[PDB]
Amino acid sequence: AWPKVQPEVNIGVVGHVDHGKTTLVQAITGIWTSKHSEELKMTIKLGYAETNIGVCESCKKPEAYVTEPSCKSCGSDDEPKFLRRISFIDAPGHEVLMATMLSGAALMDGAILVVAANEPFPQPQTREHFVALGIIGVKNLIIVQNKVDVVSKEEALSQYRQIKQFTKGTWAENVPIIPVSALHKINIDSLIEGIEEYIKTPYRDLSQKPVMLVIRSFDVNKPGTQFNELKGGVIGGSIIQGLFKVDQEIKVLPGLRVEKQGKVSYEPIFTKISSIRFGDEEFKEAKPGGLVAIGTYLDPSLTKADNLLGSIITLADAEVPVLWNIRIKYNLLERVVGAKEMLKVDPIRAKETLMLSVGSSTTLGIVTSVKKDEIEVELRRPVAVWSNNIRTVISRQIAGRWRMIGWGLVEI
Numbered sequence: 001a002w003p004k005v006q007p008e009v010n011i012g013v014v015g016h017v018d019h020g021k022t023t024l025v026q027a028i029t030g031i032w033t034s035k036h037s038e039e040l041k042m043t044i045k046l047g048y049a050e051t052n053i054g055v056c057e058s059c060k061k062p063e064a065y066v067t068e069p070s071c072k073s074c075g076s077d078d079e080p081k082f083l084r085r086i087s088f089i090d091a092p093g094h095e096v097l098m099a100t101m102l103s104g105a106a107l108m109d110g111a112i113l114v115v116a117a118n119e120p121f122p123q124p125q126t127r128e129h130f131v132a133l134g135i136i137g138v139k140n141l142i143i144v145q146n147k148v149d150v151v152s153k154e155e156a157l158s159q160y161r162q163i164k165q166f167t168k169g170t171w172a173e174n175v176p177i178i179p180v181s182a183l184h185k186i187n188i189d190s191l192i193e194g195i196e197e198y199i200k201t202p203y204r205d206l207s208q209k210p211v212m213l214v215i216r217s218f219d220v221n222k223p224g225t226q227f228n229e230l231k232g233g234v235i236g237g238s239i240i241q242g243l244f245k246v247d248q249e250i251k252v253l254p255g256l257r258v259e260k261q262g263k264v265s266y267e268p269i270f271t272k273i274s275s276i277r278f279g280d281e282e283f284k285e286a287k288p289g290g291l292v293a294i295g296t297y298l299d300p301s302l303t304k305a306d307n308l309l310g311s312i313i314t315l316a317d318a319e320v321p322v323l324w325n326i327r328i329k330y331n332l333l334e335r336v337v338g339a340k341e342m343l344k345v346d347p348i349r350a351k352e353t354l355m356l357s358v359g360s361s362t363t364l365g366i367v368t369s370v371k372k373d374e375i376e377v378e379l380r381r382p383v384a385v386w387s388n389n390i391r392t393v394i395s396r397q398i399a400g401r402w403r404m405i406g407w408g409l410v411e412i
């Protein structure tokens with residue numbers, strides 16, 4: 001029947017708070033995103049909801065589209081044609097969402113801009129998310145008009161107009177607008193069809209060296225003491241490129257922090273892949289797409305606290321520079337994140353202490369020199385630079401709190 005494969009596409013869900021991202025994700029997948037549980041909390045709150053997509057050939061559209069191995073909803077006893085498993089990226093925070101997208105933490109091959117039909121468009125967060133979408137160059141964008149139930153058939157009209165006008169003269173000039181109610185499960189199939197049409201699975205260079213982004217780490221082992229029965233540490237993450245295998249030898253970068261009297265260094269952590277799993281199904285290899293769990297032979301202490309948070313996984317023999325001093329070609333956002341006002345950002349200065357997030361990593365840095373849009377930065381925690389223009393997000397000290405001011409590309 002329907003096979004069991006890992007997800008092959010990451011689709012980000014963006015849009016202003018209370019507009020219905022989580023509800024939309026639940027509509028498509030049937031999963032309520034976690035782990036926010038009770039509102040709480042540098043841990044990366046990110047929900048990964050998965051589902052398979054299929055087409056009921058014997059049905060017409062959009063009803064032919066299903067997420068379960070049945071076509072009964074269409075009226076056929078045939079089995080649907082499996083297409084692909086999808087992974088959705090959802091966030092509890094607007095700040096968290098911006099930091100994830102701008103730092104290259106939330107790898108997405110396309111996205112979904114959630115827009116409430118009951119609020120004036122575009123809301124501030126909708127704008128900022130749009131700029132974010134543009135910057136990281138996700139062009140496969142579906143704009144979703146949500147909450148169409150609490151609005152007259154003619155108010156969504158006005159909204160659509162506003163959207164299409166907002167997009168004219170931009171790259172999103174031709175991106176579609178699909179109206180639905182996430183809450184009432186209305187016209188969701190159409191959105192699946194659209195997801196199939198405008199957000200296609202990209203070609204992936206199987207040759208490139210394997211890189212995993214560690215977005216979490218932990219200890220599976222239970223409270224009752226195993227006593228030598230202990231399962232090794234598990235690392236959760238997203239694979240950027242290439243493939244990892246079971247039993248494959250890998251290393252964690254930068255790795256273990258060592259301090260020899262004011263002498264700060266990092267030693268790569270070497271281990272073997274004991275297991276791979278997406279969801280609750282086990283696998284043999286792991287490619288880009290979706291959130292993976294990697295069973296290792298690590299001592300569960302090294303991984304217990306999301307301790308290897310902000311790290312990178314590569315093959316053990318891979319030549320990846322772990323840099324202490326980096327160069328960034330940066331840009332300043334027009335608005336400080338989540339702030340109401342205008343041009344309240346000064347370009348980067350001399351001895352300034354910043355907070356840089358490169359991927360899942362977060363470290364303090366000091367600017368040593370600054371050209372125009374070219375800054376040299378010295379870090380308290382080095383960064384594994386696995387490609388040329390990997391991205392970072394920049395925060396400076398304002399009023400006793402870290403505030404995102406810009407973003408940039410690392411250059412070597």
Ligand SMILES: Nc1nc2c(ncn2[C@@H]2O[C@H](COP(=O)(O)OP(=O)(O)O)[C@@H](O)[C@H]2O)c(=O)[nH]1
Pocket residue numbers: 016017018019020021022023024114146147148149150180181182183184
């Ligand atoms: N009337 C209506 N309400 C909705 C719809 N979708 C979500 N809501 C409500 O909006 C609130 C915010 O939903 P949520 O999914 O948490 O939004 P997000 O996570 O901020 O995108 C929830 O209390 C829902 O009850 C919709 O399609 N119609």
Ligand SMILES: [Mg+2]
Pocket residue numbers: 021022091092
């Ligand atoms: Mg939510």
